[PDB]
Write an enzyme that holds these catalytic residues in place. Structure first.
Site, mmCIF file in Angstrom:
data_model
loop_
_atom_site.group_PDB
_atom_site.id
_atom_site.type_symbol
_atom_site.label_atom_id
_atom_site.label_comp_id
_atom_site.label_asym_id
_atom_site.label_seq_id
_atom_site.Cartn_x
_atom_site.Cartn_y
_atom_site.Cartn_z
ATOM 1 N N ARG A 69 0.821 -1.193 0.013
ATOM 2 C CA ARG A 69 -0.084 0.246 0.034
ATOM 3 C C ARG A 69 0.796 1.127 0.074
ATOM 4 O O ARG A 69 2.018 1.284 0.514
ATOM 5 C CB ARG A 69 -0.720 -0.102 1.357
ATOM 6 C CG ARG A 69 -1.824 1.286 1.614
ATOM 7 C CD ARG A 69 -2.460 1.343 2.780
ATOM 8 N NE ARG A 69 -3.592 2.423 2.488
ATOM 9 C CZ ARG A 69 -4.053 3.058 3.668
ATOM 10 N NH1 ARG A 69 -3.900 2.581 5.106
ATOM 11 N NH2 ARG A 69 -4.825 3.954 3.582
ATOM 12 N N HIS A 70 0.227 2.391 -0.682
ATOM 13 C CA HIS A 70 0.814 3.645 -0.646
ATOM 14 C C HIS A 70 1.409 4.087 0.845
ATOM 15 O O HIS A 70 0.773 3.584 1.677
ATOM 16 C CB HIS A 70 0.191 4.603 -1.256
ATOM 17 C CG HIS A 70 -1.035 5.037 -0.482
ATOM 18 N ND1 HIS A 70 -1.141 5.906 0.192
ATOM 19 C CD2 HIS A 70 -2.425 4.541 -0.594
ATOM 20 C CE1 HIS A 70 -2.441 5.947 0.839
ATOM 21 N NE2 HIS A 70 -3.007 5.197 0.288
ATOM 22 N N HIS A 97 -3.259 0.252 -3.111
ATOM 23 C CA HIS A 97 -4.143 0.741 -2.107
ATOM 24 C C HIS A 97 -4.381 -0.532 -1.218
ATOM 25 O O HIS A 97 -4.111 -1.581 -1.374
ATOM 26 C CB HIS A 97 -5.511 1.205 -2.888
ATOM 27 C CG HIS A 97 -5.273 2.052 -4.058
ATOM 28 N ND1 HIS A 97 -5.237 3.531 -3.733
ATOM 29 C CD2 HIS A 97 -5.060 2.082 -5.242
ATOM 30 C CE1 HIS A 97 -5.246 4.182 -4.618
ATOM 31 N NE2 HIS A 97 -5.116 3.275 -5.941
#
Lengths: 262, 256
Positions: A8-9, A194
């Site tokens: 995930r970012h 995400h």
């Protein structure tokens, strides 16, 4: 020995500084004036104006740190990455760029922006999809993207406010095309996307069926920034399996105390 | 133009990883094995064994970042620091060291470890004060402390489980001796210490009386990591006043 890593970012502006963070760092003339040390020294020029950031926030300074740490971790574990894909959200691009730095690969390796990796389009507040920065504007902004890359699902093929299993499908479909266009061409694949992408991208790859759309959102708010998981392919039989990540997890707390005083 | 800056240490091991973090990164032989990316690549050898960390935890990796950012901020604002004092807690020393790095001053400037800057001794779990690393063991551990420094309140002059206004007093007393032993010798002073230190050190310097011991603890859990405030002296009349800090505040959330 082939690996899909999906993470995930990193820490995102509009969460720390909340919905209206834009009025906190842009004046009337549109100049960026940082008001907090967790805000980058500069933000990239969006061809549509500073307003475009609203539906596409960047990562914070501690956002970069998280990502750097992950890249360095990856390098310490002598884990080689051959291809790196990301969602088109700026936050995802920026996290991929900074992973490549820690990895010491930012000007050898090139990020492949894949609109098919974007999150479930329900979570897009607004009637209209974010104004993503196209790859070539992104290189021009000092991110190591591949302008050569032709997307599996381009932007126009994305339904606004789409069906849940539409989202699940494209995830399975995109991850599938990614795994195979990288086959003849070396081992480890990294996807930067995400929270939802961790489950969605890998789930059916291991032959497991998805949680229905209620237990999903539960598991999605579960996932930390730079949350990281990995998959291994046995033989080239096409079957993937869950695996212990090649790097330590990353946990830390907030600055805390009072967000505001006097 | 003289300035006292007082700021709190950075993110602390035993809070992120909680009370028993020791069992999470030391094996039976006493080897350090980090189990999280927010844990430093190595911890300093405490002459008493890894067990001494229990009452004196170090800062996390994001702990260093916070401090670095503050240092750099300070440098960008062209704010010169002349003397830097810290509490003897390892977390404080480490925060001071890392501020000096951002400031680009770690091998020009030298931290003065002052046991008088230590927090209210009530918050020391245990019957006995922490086994602080003495300055010379600290230099030996790559922290930029001054081994030459003679403390205003040495360790032995600290009461375990002390009175509240004893704590308040020593704060006022220590800060007072600090301001004056640095007078003839250049402008800005930096103290790196504890949440309680922000209020306690400055309060009576501005002539304000302290909150009684209940409203205090309220204001103490208020203060963030690298929480930062500043004081300015008008003339050399001895009167200090509150002032806008020379650097932006630092806010960030958790990994979650």
């Amino acid at each position: 020995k082939r690996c899909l890593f999906v993470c995930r970012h990193g820490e995102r502006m509009d969460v720390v500084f909340g919905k209206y963070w834009l009025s906190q760092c842009f004046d009337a003339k549109g100049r960026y004036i940082r008001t907090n040390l967790n805000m980058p020294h500069s933000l990239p020029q969006r061809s549509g104006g500073f307003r475009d950031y609203e539906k596409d926030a960047p990562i914070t300074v501690f956002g970069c740190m998280q990502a750097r740490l992950v890249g360095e971790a990856l390098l310490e574990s002598n884990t080689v990455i051959d291809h790196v894909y990301c969602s088109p959200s700026l936050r995802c691009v920026q996290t991929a760029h900074n992973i490549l730095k820690g990895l010491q690969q930012d000007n050898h390796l090139k990020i492949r922006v894949e609109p098919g990796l974007f999150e479930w389009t329900k979570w897009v507040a607004g009637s209209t999809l974010p104004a993503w920065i196209p790859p070539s504007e992104l290189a021009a902004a000092n991110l190591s993207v591949d302008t050569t890359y032709r997307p599996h699902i381009p932007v126009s093929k994305l339904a606004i406010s789409e069906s849940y299993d539409t989202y699940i499908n494209r995830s399975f479909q995109v991850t599938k095309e990614i795994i195979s266009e990288c086959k003849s061409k070396g081992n480890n694949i990294l996807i930067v996307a995400h929270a939802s992408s961790l489950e969605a991208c890998t789930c059916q790859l291991q032959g497991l069926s998805p949680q229905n759309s209620k237990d999903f959102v539960q598991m999605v708010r579960k996932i930390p920034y730079l949350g990281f998981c990995s998959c291994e392919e046995l033989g080239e039989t096409g079957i993937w399996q869950l695996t212990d990540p090649p790097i330590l997890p990353l946990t830390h707390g907030p600055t805390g105390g009072f967000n505001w005083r006097e």
